[PDB]
Amino acid sequence: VSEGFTVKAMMKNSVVRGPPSAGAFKERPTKPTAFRKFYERGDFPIALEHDSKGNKIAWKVEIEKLDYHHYLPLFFDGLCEMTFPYEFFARQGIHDMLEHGGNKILPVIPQLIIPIKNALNLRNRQVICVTLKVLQHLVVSAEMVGEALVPYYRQILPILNIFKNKNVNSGDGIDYSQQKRENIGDLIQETLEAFERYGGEDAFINIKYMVPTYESCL
Amino acid sequence: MFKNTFQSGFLSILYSIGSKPLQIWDKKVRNGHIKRITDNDIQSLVLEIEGTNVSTTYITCPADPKKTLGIKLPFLVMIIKNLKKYFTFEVQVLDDKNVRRRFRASNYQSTTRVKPFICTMPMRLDDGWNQIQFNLSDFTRRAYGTNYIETLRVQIHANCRIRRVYFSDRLYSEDELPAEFK
Amino acid sequence: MRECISIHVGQAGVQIGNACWELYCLEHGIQPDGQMPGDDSFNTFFSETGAGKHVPRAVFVDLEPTVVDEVRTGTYRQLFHPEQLITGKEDAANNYARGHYTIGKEIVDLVLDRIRKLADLCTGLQGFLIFHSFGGGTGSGFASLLMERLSVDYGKKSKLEFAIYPAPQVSTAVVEPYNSILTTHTTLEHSDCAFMVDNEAIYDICRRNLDIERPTYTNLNRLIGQIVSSITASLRFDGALNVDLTEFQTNLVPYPRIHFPLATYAPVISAEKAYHEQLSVAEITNACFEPANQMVKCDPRHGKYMACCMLYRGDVVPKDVNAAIATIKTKRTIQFVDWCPTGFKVGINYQPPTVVPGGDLAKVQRAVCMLSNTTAIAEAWARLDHKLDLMYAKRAFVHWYVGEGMEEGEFSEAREDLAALEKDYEEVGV
Amino acid sequence: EVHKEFQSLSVFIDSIPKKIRKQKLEEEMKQLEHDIGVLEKHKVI
Amino acid sequence: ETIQLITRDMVRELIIPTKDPSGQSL
Amino acid sequence: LRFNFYTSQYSNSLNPFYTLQKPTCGYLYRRDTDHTRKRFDVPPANLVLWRS
Amino acid sequence: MREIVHLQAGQCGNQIGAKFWEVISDEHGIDPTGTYHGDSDLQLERINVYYNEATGGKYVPRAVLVDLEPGTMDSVRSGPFGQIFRPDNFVFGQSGAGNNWAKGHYTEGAELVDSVLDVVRKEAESCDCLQGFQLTHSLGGGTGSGMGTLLISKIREEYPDRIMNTFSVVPSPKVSDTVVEPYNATLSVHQLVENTDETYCIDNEALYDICFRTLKLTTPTYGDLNHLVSATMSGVTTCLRFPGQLNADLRKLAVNMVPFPRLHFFMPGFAPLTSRGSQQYRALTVPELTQQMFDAKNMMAACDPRHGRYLTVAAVFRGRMSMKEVDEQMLNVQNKNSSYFVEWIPNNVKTAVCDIPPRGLKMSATFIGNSTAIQELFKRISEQFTAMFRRKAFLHWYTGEGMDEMEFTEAESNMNDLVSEYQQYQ
Ligand SMILES: Nc1nc2c(ncn2[C@@H]2O[C@H](COP(=O)(O)OP(=O)(O)OP(=O)(O)O)[C@@H](O)[C@H]2O)c(=O)[nH]1
Ligand SMILES: Nc1nc2c(ncn2[C@@H]2O[C@H](COP(=O)(O)OP(=O)(O)O)[C@@H](O)[C@H]2O)c(=O)[nH]1
Ligand SMILES: [Mg+2]
């Protein structure tokens, strides 16, 4: 075969090889995070009660009087684990502290970009759908959050450009997995709609600069 | 096609409820997809078609390119969900002068050029679901001197949510229309 | 995802667990090191790591480091995790208040961590299994704290107790009429079901049905391992009528006050009586109803059955099951209560009972375990109440309890509580 | 030849050897019936 | 082979059984 | 033009009436058969993730 | 054309659906890998009533498999025909109800019901013209008897005009399988009446009697009973799939068989039942067929009919058969014992003829019958309810999920009235 731009390739009948590969669309190897270390030592005030109707997290302290500058930026880093208990505990901790996060999510927004991207930089589809769901939850559950994320669009959107054209060409087959919202590109579409909806008139010029095939809604 | 059919008060071609909706339809998709979804606005199945290029992916109403379907019904109604996206659809009609003429309705147009093969016209839409009304006889009466005898083909492009594309003999109000056509 | 967590309290509980987890290691083939030479039968008793090592989902708790050190330096020392077994410093020594108020107070925070670190590894865990003794201090005082703390802080899930009831004639200790009264008063509102066993009945079973003199406690722990394996067989092995861990309390306890059935394992036959006796179903389910073949010394002739739960294993043909239960219904000698006319529950497993080397039971192919709650169990509480009336009349060992934080009114509270439980027991069977 | 024996069984079957004998005769007859009916379906093998 | 029965609303294709035995071969 | 190979696997009848079941009864027992519980292929209904 | 939606809830319904889809796959010639492998062309023309089309020629069974614990669909996946079932049609929790109506109807079975409703509505609109629904479950349990009855109460409000027949499991006369079935069964049958128009009542003792007396099988399992049930479930929906000279769909068997909406309780049978030792001594004729259904020992509900009186009687047949003789036989069985039919209807028998027999058979029939003796199933369940409610036996397990006390009184009054209304036609 031919390596490339050489005179072996000058042959009228030669076979040249392509470039090797790139790391895009392939799962990047995981790293140990702070969540397991802080959990196995007994720091988090949570304990799983295995309810029959679906599992629910139990808080033995009052959630409305917790430190959101210490728990939430480190609960967000727990999303990057996919073993079994830690992903559930981190996901439901983020969901149950965003639900009761009245006027306490605004100052901690610059402290949670790094765990969000670090969880998003692993090319696992389940963790990406989970992070997209919690990012959908993040912009809605309070006020003044959406336009506070506007200067951070240039560092969370690059991985939101990868899987947006991932969907299913099933023809006339109704998607039996519409319940389990695992189609990643559809989720990216609603998440970008949510980012346009909250964020003011400076939103569109910031999804456009990052994602070039977006289209202005609203 | 559809020559030995009665062509009643309403004639339906596409429907998201059933076994094979795109049986007589062609599936052309390039950088897009075709799929069916239980909708969260009407609690029923709706055809879904979208792609990054609006002209590459579509569905044409006779599958065979040389075969054409014949509809003598004058009015065209289609239920589409407005996703605030680029959506075009185009018909082909016959005249008493035996010329196949086309009408193009484009979401990204604001102008109207009339020409002896295709007359392009703009299109606006409301928020969500809609009943877009088309009188083919009027469109062949104002732009063109002739009248309408037979519809030949209809095309639906991407960035849209199709349910129940049909033809009707006359404008049916909300009362006389059966509940399965809403 | 059908896990369960077994809690063993005291040197009755840990000695039961030592021989019960041997059967658990043998029915699944778990090596004593903890390796398996896709199977999902061991998930209800074992967990997996990346290196293929199986760690059991149990806790062995005691207040002295003596008997647990036998496990820690015995055969299975690499199977259990070191921190999964909880030891104390000085035992309660046949005292309820010492193990319930002062020295049971510091250890509960060193056991709740284990339960919470163990339950997080289980997704669909079904409940809790408790083995402890009334006749001691750790298994009666420390276990009562565990029941109270779980029932206030763990939810509406299940807690079945295989408690070792004191024998009616013989007993080891002498002050256990106090601790049995106090534990029964404590847990009769913070529990859902509790099976009873006593050791004299299993003694005369091993002497009569089996062919040896002089059995040890290891010869008694094997039958407890067999009954606990037949109880949880359905979650581990396939069957026609699976029995989950949720419908023992749904089927055996009608009322909040009565939650005390009996227990009986049917094919207690040595390998000598195995090659002679027939190999059908009907003659072994006719032996669970013999009062001599019982694991609690009582007669159901003076009592009435409320509900029964028969679990079968092996080549049980359901026609013989149907005909045997019908012929059980035909007998006048077994009489029932008016308000439970059906009375039976049948669960069938496709797995024959496994054979433990060093055991004394034969290699049998069918097995029946029967759990019935019977009004005749009220005489056991009646004779224990008579014992407490003879004891408290002369104020016998009262000073051993008030000296560490037990009030005088707790005696009256426990006595009146069990008097009310008696009154309810005779008002149930009418 | 197997079915010749099956009609010579007891008319009231209660014991365990009679039961197991009926089971093996039924298993033999059914193995042979499956083999016969599989081959009889066509002509080319 | 299949024959197309195009009616109003519903479009159905129906198959025609053939008279060939055609055999099999284990 | 049609193969349809042998199965050696009885596939339910009514006139002879043998029912295809794994052996769990008399005669055909074979005590070393595998009556254990296996691994599935579908997760349970985790409704907490399905809507989030 | 007229597609059938199949519902199964609980482990009894799951085993029944495991065996029912072992017979339909046999008769429509469906491989365990999901491919047509038959040798005819009559089996492919109306295959849409049970199998949707998948990419690659694959035929998946259109059904909903519902449970609340993973302890029984491991068996249906490990079964011989468990690979054709679609993964997304499985909906199940982790901790089950455990012989409880209150849990599986209000607390556990009500949170997961939105997933089952979503799966049903997503699947049911994939039919071209839906005919109706069919549910197999057990009243004596808690998973089926709560959750499937919740589905019964919800889908009927969803589509208020489709056919809903059920294959229910009523209790045994003497042997019990659960101590609390006088609670779950009555609380399910109180809700069954106002939503269903046809109820097939099956019980296990009658099937044991069938498999022992009429069959000479000495070691029958539950699968040998599931096969006998599946014979009737395939017999009922016969004419939908295959042509003939006298067809009958489920609407045909609904209009013809109930004079009143509260009289929709039925009890089935199956015609050819010859032992292996009685094969060569008996001839498959229509009189020897028609003798068996009007005999008590060939019936799938443990209720002797000469206590009662047949109101409406249905019978479908199979195979290319003579017709003058079958009408003669029904007239003879109608005119000999005139005391076993009511006198205010002259023609109580419905006849439908197909031409494709079940495989390995040539002549067969399936009898669906409403009568008066089915009351004996409900009278004793009411007396058991009175014997248990007068002592408030297991009531604490039911009030602990958000139930009430007057609801039980209302259920017992409605069931006593349903009891009383059937008795006037004796
Ligand atoms: N069947 C059986 N009974 C046991 C066993 N070990 C102890 N017992 C019983 O337990 C009773 C005494 O209570 P224990 O469990 O021994 O002691 P404890 O409950 O931990 O309380 P402490 O003595 O203070 O540690 C005696 O009546 C024994 O019969 C055993 O291995 N098997
Ligand atoms: N005919 C038949 N009945 C069954 C089968 N499996 C279970 N049953 C019946 O189901 C009843 C018990 O159902 P149960 O386990 O309590 O249902 P659950 O609510 O899902 O737990 C018993 O009375 C059995 O007779 C089967 O395979 N066939
Ligand atoms: Mg001790």
Short mmCIF file of N, CA and C in Angstrom, two decimals, chain A residues 43-123:
data_model
loop_
_atom_site.label_atom_id
_atom_site.label_comp_id
_atom_site.label_asym_id
_atom_site.label_seq_id
_atom_site.Cartn_x
_atom_site.Cartn_y
_atom_site.Cartn_z
N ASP A 43 -19.93 11.58 54.04
CA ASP A 43 -20.13 13.02 54.12
C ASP A 43 -21.55 13.44 53.76
N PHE A 44 -22.14 12.81 52.76
CA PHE A 44 -23.44 13.26 52.26
C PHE A 44 -24.55 12.86 53.22
N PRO A 45 -25.48 13.76 53.52
CA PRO A 45 -26.60 13.43 54.43
C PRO A 45 -27.77 12.78 53.70
N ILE A 46 -27.49 11.69 52.98
CA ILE A 46 -28.49 10.98 52.20
C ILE A 46 -28.40 9.49 52.48
N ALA A 47 -29.51 8.80 52.24
CA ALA A 47 -29.59 7.35 52.42
C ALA A 47 -30.74 6.85 51.57
N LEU A 48 -30.47 5.89 50.69
CA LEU A 48 -31.46 5.44 49.72
C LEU A 48 -32.55 4.62 50.41
N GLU A 49 -33.79 5.06 50.24
CA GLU A 49 -34.95 4.25 50.59
C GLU A 49 -35.52 3.69 49.29
N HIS A 50 -35.66 2.37 49.23
CA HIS A 50 -36.00 1.70 47.98
C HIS A 50 -37.52 1.59 47.90
N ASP A 51 -38.15 2.68 47.49
CA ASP A 51 -39.60 2.71 47.37
C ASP A 51 -40.06 1.88 46.18
N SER A 52 -41.24 1.27 46.33
CA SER A 52 -41.75 0.33 45.33
C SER A 52 -42.11 1.03 44.02
N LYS A 53 -42.57 2.27 44.09
CA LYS A 53 -43.04 3.01 42.93
C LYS A 53 -41.92 3.66 42.13
N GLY A 54 -40.67 3.27 42.38
CA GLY A 54 -39.53 3.98 41.83
C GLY A 54 -38.69 4.52 42.97
N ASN A 55 -37.37 4.48 42.82
CA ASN A 55 -36.49 4.86 43.91
C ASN A 55 -36.49 6.37 44.12
N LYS A 56 -36.40 6.77 45.38
CA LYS A 56 -36.42 8.17 45.78
C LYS A 56 -35.36 8.39 46.85
N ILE A 57 -34.67 9.52 46.77
CA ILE A 57 -33.60 9.85 47.70
C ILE A 57 -34.21 10.47 48.96
N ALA A 58 -33.63 10.15 50.11
CA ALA A 58 -34.13 10.59 51.40
C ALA A 58 -33.10 11.51 52.05
N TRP A 59 -33.55 12.70 52.45
CA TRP A 59 -32.68 13.69 53.07
C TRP A 59 -33.00 13.77 54.56
N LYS A 60 -32.00 13.51 55.40
CA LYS A 60 -32.16 13.56 56.84
C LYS A 60 -31.85 14.94 57.41
N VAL A 61 -31.57 15.92 56.54
CA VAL A 61 -31.45 17.32 56.93
C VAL A 61 -32.44 18.12 56.09
N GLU A 62 -32.70 19.34 56.54
CA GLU A 62 -33.57 20.24 55.79
C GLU A 62 -32.84 20.71 54.53
N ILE A 63 -33.45 20.47 53.37
CA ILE A 63 -32.78 20.76 52.10
C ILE A 63 -32.67 22.26 51.86
N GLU A 64 -33.63 23.05 52.36
CA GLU A 64 -33.65 24.48 52.09
C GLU A 64 -32.59 25.25 52.86
N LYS A 65 -31.91 24.62 53.82
CA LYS A 65 -30.87 25.26 54.62
C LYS A 65 -29.59 24.44 54.54
N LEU A 66 -29.16 24.15 53.32
CA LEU A 66 -27.90 23.49 53.04
C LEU A 66 -26.96 24.46 52.32
N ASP A 67 -25.67 24.13 52.34
CA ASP A 67 -24.66 24.94 51.66
C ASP A 67 -24.62 24.52 50.20
N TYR A 68 -25.03 25.43 49.32
CA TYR A 68 -25.02 25.15 47.89
C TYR A 68 -23.69 25.48 47.24
N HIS A 69 -22.76 26.09 47.97
CA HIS A 69 -21.41 26.33 47.48
C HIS A 69 -20.47 25.17 47.75
N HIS A 70 -20.91 24.16 48.49
CA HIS A 70 -20.08 23.00 48.81
C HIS A 70 -20.65 21.69 48.28
N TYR A 71 -21.97 21.51 48.35
CA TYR A 71 -22.58 20.26 47.92
C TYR A 71 -22.85 20.23 46.42
N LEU A 72 -23.50 21.27 45.89
CA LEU A 72 -23.89 21.30 44.48
C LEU A 72 -22.72 21.27 43.50
N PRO A 73 -21.62 22.04 43.65
CA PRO A 73 -20.51 21.89 42.70
C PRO A 73 -19.83 20.53 42.76
N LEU A 74 -19.96 19.81 43.87
CA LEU A 74 -19.36 18.49 44.00
C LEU A 74 -20.35 17.37 43.69
N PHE A 75 -21.65 17.62 43.88
CA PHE A 75 -22.67 16.71 43.36
C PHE A 75 -22.65 16.68 41.84
N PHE A 76 -22.38 17.82 41.20
CA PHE A 76 -22.31 17.88 39.75
C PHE A 76 -21.16 17.05 39.20
N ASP A 77 -20.04 16.99 39.93
CA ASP A 77 -18.91 16.17 39.51
C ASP A 77 -19.20 14.68 39.65
N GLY A 78 -20.23 14.31 40.41
CA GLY A 78 -20.60 12.92 40.55
C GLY A 78 -21.31 12.33 39.36
N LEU A 79 -21.72 13.16 38.40
CA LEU A 79 -22.36 12.65 37.19
C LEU A 79 -21.40 11.87 36.32
N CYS A 80 -20.10 12.14 36.41
CA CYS A 80 -19.09 11.49 35.58
C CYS A 80 -18.83 10.03 35.97
N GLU A 81 -19.52 9.51 36.98
CA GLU A 81 -19.44 8.10 37.34
C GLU A 81 -20.67 7.37 36.82
N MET A 82 -20.48 6.12 36.40
CA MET A 82 -21.54 5.33 35.77
C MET A 82 -21.57 3.92 36.31
N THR A 83 -21.18 3.72 37.57
CA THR A 83 -21.08 2.35 38.10
C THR A 83 -22.46 1.77 38.38
N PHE A 84 -23.16 2.31 39.40
CA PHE A 84 -24.56 2.04 39.71
C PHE A 84 -25.01 3.07 40.75
N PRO A 85 -24.52 3.08 42.02
CA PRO A 85 -25.22 3.92 43.00
C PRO A 85 -24.87 5.40 42.87
N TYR A 86 -23.65 5.69 42.42
CA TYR A 86 -23.14 7.06 42.46
C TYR A 86 -23.80 7.93 41.40
N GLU A 87 -24.06 7.38 40.21
CA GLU A 87 -24.76 8.13 39.18
C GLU A 87 -26.17 8.49 39.62
N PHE A 88 -26.88 7.53 40.24
CA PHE A 88 -28.22 7.80 40.75
C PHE A 88 -28.16 8.87 41.83
N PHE A 89 -27.23 8.73 42.78
CA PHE A 89 -27.18 9.66 43.90
C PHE A 89 -26.85 11.07 43.43
N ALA A 90 -25.91 11.20 42.49
CA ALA A 90 -25.57 12.52 41.96
C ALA A 90 -26.72 13.12 41.16
N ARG A 91 -27.37 12.32 40.30
CA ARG A 91 -28.45 12.83 39.46
C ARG A 91 -29.63 13.29 40.31
N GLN A 92 -30.05 12.47 41.27
CA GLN A 92 -31.17 12.87 42.10
C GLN A 92 -30.80 13.94 43.12
N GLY A 93 -29.53 14.04 43.52
CA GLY A 93 -29.13 15.17 44.34
C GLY A 93 -29.22 16.48 43.59
N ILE A 94 -28.78 16.49 42.33
CA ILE A 94 -28.89 17.69 41.50
C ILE A 94 -30.36 18.05 41.28
N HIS A 95 -31.19 17.04 41.00
CA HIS A 95 -32.61 17.31 40.74
C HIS A 95 -33.34 17.79 41.99
N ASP A 96 -33.05 17.20 43.15
CA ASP A 96 -33.74 17.59 44.38
C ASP A 96 -33.13 18.81 45.05
N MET A 97 -31.98 19.29 44.60
CA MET A 97 -31.51 20.58 45.08
C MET A 97 -31.78 21.71 44.09
N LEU A 98 -32.05 21.38 42.82
CA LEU A 98 -32.55 22.39 41.90
C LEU A 98 -34.02 22.70 42.14
N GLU A 99 -34.78 21.70 42.61
CA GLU A 99 -36.20 21.90 42.89
C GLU A 99 -36.41 22.87 44.05
N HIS A 100 -35.56 22.80 45.07
CA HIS A 100 -35.67 23.62 46.27
C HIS A 100 -34.52 24.62 46.34
N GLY A 101 -34.15 25.19 45.20
CA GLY A 101 -33.03 26.10 45.12
C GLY A 101 -33.43 27.54 44.88
N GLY A 102 -34.46 28.00 45.59
CA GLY A 102 -34.87 29.39 45.51
C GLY A 102 -33.75 30.33 45.91
N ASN A 103 -33.45 31.30 45.03
CA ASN A 103 -32.40 32.32 45.10
C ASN A 103 -31.09 31.86 45.71
N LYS A 104 -30.68 30.62 45.39
CA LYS A 104 -29.42 30.07 45.85
C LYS A 104 -28.60 29.45 44.73
N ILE A 105 -29.13 29.41 43.50
CA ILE A 105 -28.40 28.85 42.37
C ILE A 105 -27.63 29.92 41.61
N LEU A 106 -28.01 31.19 41.76
CA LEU A 106 -27.34 32.27 41.03
C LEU A 106 -25.85 32.44 41.35
N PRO A 107 -25.39 32.51 42.61
CA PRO A 107 -23.96 32.76 42.82
C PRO A 107 -23.06 31.56 42.57
N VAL A 108 -23.62 30.35 42.49
CA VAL A 108 -22.82 29.14 42.35
C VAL A 108 -22.69 28.72 40.88
N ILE A 109 -23.38 29.43 39.97
CA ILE A 109 -23.28 29.12 38.53
C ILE A 109 -21.85 29.14 37.99
N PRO A 110 -20.97 30.10 38.32
CA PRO A 110 -19.57 29.97 37.85
C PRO A 110 -18.79 28.84 38.50
N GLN A 111 -19.32 28.19 39.54
CA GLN A 111 -18.62 27.11 40.21
C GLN A 111 -19.03 25.72 39.72
N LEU A 112 -19.87 25.63 38.69
CA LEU A 112 -20.36 24.33 38.23
C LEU A 112 -20.25 24.15 36.72
N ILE A 113 -19.50 25.01 36.03
CA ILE A 113 -19.26 24.80 34.61
C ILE A 113 -18.31 23.63 34.39
N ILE A 114 -17.25 23.55 35.21
CA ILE A 114 -16.23 22.51 35.03
C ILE A 114 -16.78 21.09 35.23
N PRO A 115 -17.54 20.78 36.30
CA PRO A 115 -18.13 19.43 36.37
C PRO A 115 -19.10 19.13 35.25
N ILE A 116 -19.86 20.13 34.78
CA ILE A 116 -20.80 19.92 33.68
C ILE A 116 -20.06 19.52 32.41
N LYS A 117 -18.98 20.24 32.08
CA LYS A 117 -18.25 19.89 30.87
C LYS A 117 -17.51 18.57 31.04
N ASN A 118 -16.94 18.32 32.23
CA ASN A 118 -16.19 17.09 32.46
C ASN A 118 -17.08 15.86 32.35
N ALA A 119 -18.32 15.95 32.84
CA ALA A 119 -19.28 14.89 32.60
C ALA A 119 -19.68 14.83 31.13
N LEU A 120 -19.78 15.98 30.47
CA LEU A 120 -20.16 15.99 29.06
C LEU A 120 -19.02 15.57 28.13
N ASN A 121 -17.77 15.64 28.58
CA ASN A 121 -16.64 15.31 27.72
C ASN A 121 -16.40 13.81 27.61
N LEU A 122 -17.08 12.99 28.39
CA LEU A 122 -17.04 11.55 28.23
C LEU A 122 -18.09 11.15 27.20
N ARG A 123 -17.67 10.38 26.19
CA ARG A 123 -18.57 10.06 25.09
C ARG A 123 -19.39 8.80 25.37
#
